[PDB]
Amino acid sequence: SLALSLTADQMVSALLDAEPPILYSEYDPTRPFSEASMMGLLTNLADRELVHMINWAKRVPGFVDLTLHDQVHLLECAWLEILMIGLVWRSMEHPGKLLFAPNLLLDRNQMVEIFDMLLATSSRFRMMNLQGEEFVCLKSIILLNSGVYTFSLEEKDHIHRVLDKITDTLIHLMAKAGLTLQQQHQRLAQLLLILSHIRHMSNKGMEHLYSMKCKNVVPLSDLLLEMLDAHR
Amino acid sequence: SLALSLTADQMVSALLDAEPPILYSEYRPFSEASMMGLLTNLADRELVHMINWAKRVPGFVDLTLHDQVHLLECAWLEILMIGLVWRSMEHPGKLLFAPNLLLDRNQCVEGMVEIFDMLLATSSRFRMMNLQGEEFVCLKSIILLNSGVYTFKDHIHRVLDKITDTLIHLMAKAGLTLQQQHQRLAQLLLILSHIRHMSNKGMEHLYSMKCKNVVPLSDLLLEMLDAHR
Amino acid sequence: KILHRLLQD
Amino acid sequence: KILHRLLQD
Ligand SMILES: Oc1ccc(C(=Cc2cccc(Nc3ccc(F)cc3)c2)c2ccc(O)cc2)cc1
Numbered sequence: 001s002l003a004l005s006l007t008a009d010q011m012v013s014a015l016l017d018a019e020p021p022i023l024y025s026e027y028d029p030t031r032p033f034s035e036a037s038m039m040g041l042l043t044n045l046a047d048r049e050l051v052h053m054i055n056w057a058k059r060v061p062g063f064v065d066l067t068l069h070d071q072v073h074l075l076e077c078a079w080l081e082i083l084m085i086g087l088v089w090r091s092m093e094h095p096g097k098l099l100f101a102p103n104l105l106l107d108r109n110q111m112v113e114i115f116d117m118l119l120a121t122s123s124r125f126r127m128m129n130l131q132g133e134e135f136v137c138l139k140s141i142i143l144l145n146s147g148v149y150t151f152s153l154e155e156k157d158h159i160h161r162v163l164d165k166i167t168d169t170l171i172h173l174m175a176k177a178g179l180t181l182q183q184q185h186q187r188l189a190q191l192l193l194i195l196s197h198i199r200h201m202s203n204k205g206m207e208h209l210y211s212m213k214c215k216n217v218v219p220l221s222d223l224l225l226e227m228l229d230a231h232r
Numbered sequence: 233s234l235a236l237s238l239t240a241d242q243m244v245s246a247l248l249d250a251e252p253p254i255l256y257s258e259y260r261p262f263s264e265a266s267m268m269g270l271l272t273n274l275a276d277r278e279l280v281h282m283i284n285w286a287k288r289v290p291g292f293v294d295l296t297l298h299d300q301v302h303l304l305e306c307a308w309l310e311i312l313m314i315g316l317v318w319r320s321m322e323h324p325g326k327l328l329f330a331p332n333l334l335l336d337r338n339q340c341v342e343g344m345v346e347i348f349d350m351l352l353a354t355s356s357r358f359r360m361m362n363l364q365g366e367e368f369v370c371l372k373s374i375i376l377l378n379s380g381v382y383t384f385k386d387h388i389h390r391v392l393d394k395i396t397d398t399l400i401h402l403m404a405k406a407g408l409t410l411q412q413q414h415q416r417l418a419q420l421l422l423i424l425s426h427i428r429h430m431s432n433k434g435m436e437h438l439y440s441m442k443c444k445n446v447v448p449l450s451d452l453l454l455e456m457l458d459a460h461r
Numbered sequence: 462k463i464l465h466r467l468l469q470d
Numbered sequence: 471k472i473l474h475r476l477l478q479d
């Protein structure tokens with residue numbers, strides 16, 4: 001394994017270089033539309049993001065060491081969490097708004113519960129002054145942790161070793177930022193506790209997506225549908 | 233604001249002392265309705281003790297009445313579940329709802345297999361990590377204060393920081409290295425994400441059981457359930 | 462609602 | 471599975 005022999009800086013360097021781009025939406029301001037249209041736009045976007053997420057996940061240290069079936073499981077469980085943490089990250093310096101795309105910026109006044117929870121998370125990230133290096137670590141943690149309890153033959157032991165490595169990397173980052181040992185542990189705990197809210201938001205969001213599907217007005221792509229059946 | 237003045241040891245003992253007792257189920261070979269009937273009855277009686285436990289969680293008192301209601305409404309099933317998996321540790325492959333209610337995978341109604349398996353997997357995780365009782369009561373209180381804190385507040389984050397300190401203070405003194413300390417901290421907190429997930433899954437089914445109207449819900453459970461919709 | 466009463470008693 | 475396909479180039 002290569003991932004188990006990366007130094008903290010090498011870990012960060014790899015994750016940073018593996019970052020997916022920020023895709024645009026169609027939006028069209030001239031279009032006046034709706035709740036249907038907006039969800040239609042977000043569905044299009046998510047579907048194109050998923051292709052980059054898959055190729056990004058391959059560059060996450062340790063992911064390719066897993067079997068093909070294990071890769072499938074981890075992504076099926078975590079895809080919306082990962083999309084959502086990306087969303088709140090790029091929404092940090094846009095208080096009271098969500099930047100789904102550089103041309104798609106939404107405020108509250110137009111699912112409000114999901115909106116408010118996404119806002120609360122982005123605001124939480126801003127107060128903490130979350131760093132890009134810390135963000136990419138958290139995102140990788142989500143990919144590896146969310147499906148590890150839902151899978152002899154054989155490991156997951158390996159997954160935990162890489163998770164521990166990412167933990168090491170996080171702490172290393174906080175050390176270089178001039179934090180005390182007490183501050184390092186406290187910040188670490190704060191970051192991981194937010195992963196619990198992100199799971200909550202993903203769960204609630206999955207419910208709506210399942211409603212949307214059965215009330216066949218907002219069409220899902222073939223890939224998004226397959227990802228939806230996974231959370232049966 | 234008394235919770236912040238407490239030492240680490242003072243924090244531990246206060247939490248251990250606040251622990252709710254272990255209740256019993258009723259004293260037949262189980263069907264779909266009757267099994268959920270027993271758990272429902274059990275859960276209702278446990279809630280009363282959970283509230284008195286909540287009052288004795290350092291810092292929970294300082295909150296307003298409405299903020300107490302919110303945290304409890306968001307976190308009650310999580311708290312029950314982490315309770316369930318904790319006492320199920322010494323019973324691998326089974327779930328100990330009560331000392332006279334030990335269950336295995338063999339049937340559960342339908343779709344209960346996944347929640348059963350998820351709960352069983354958490355218990356095994358606690359087993360291989362060798363989770364201590366001191367660590368457990370810390371996790372449980374963390375769940376109480378965190379799960380509703382994102383409005384779904386500065387004092388709470390200060391208290392959360394305090395409980396973090398206690399955990400690290402427990403791993404140190406257990407002989408763990410600095411590296412082993414923050415590694416174990418991370419491992420423990422990540423399981424909380426899974427516990428949130430199990431709660432969500434379990435909640436939707438209680439909402440479903442309600443619409444089926446075969447297993448009768450108590451008025452208190454109804455209110456706790458309604459708050460998730 | 463019930464919860465309030467229990468948190469006061 | 472589309473996801474499985476994409477994961478192998
Ligand atoms: O980068 C992305 C982040 C999130 C999302 C989604 C976020 C999402 C998911 C479910 C419900 C909601 N509700 C919602 C809608 C608009 C808001 F402003 C706030 C919440 C969002 C999403 C939307 C549709 C879809 O088919 C798949 C993913 C998409 C891309």
Ligand SMILES: Oc1ccc(C(=Cc2cccc(Nc3ccc(F)cc3)c2)c2ccc(O)cc2)cc1
Binds near residue numbers: 434437
């Ligand atoms: O200490 C307790 C822990 C959990 C629970 C419950 C656990 C629960 C909740 C929803 C679904 C399931 N699924 C399930 C059923 C049977 C099994 F053997 C395993 C899982 C459990 C619960 C059951 C009914 C109720 O009205 C409130 C809480 C009760 C007490």
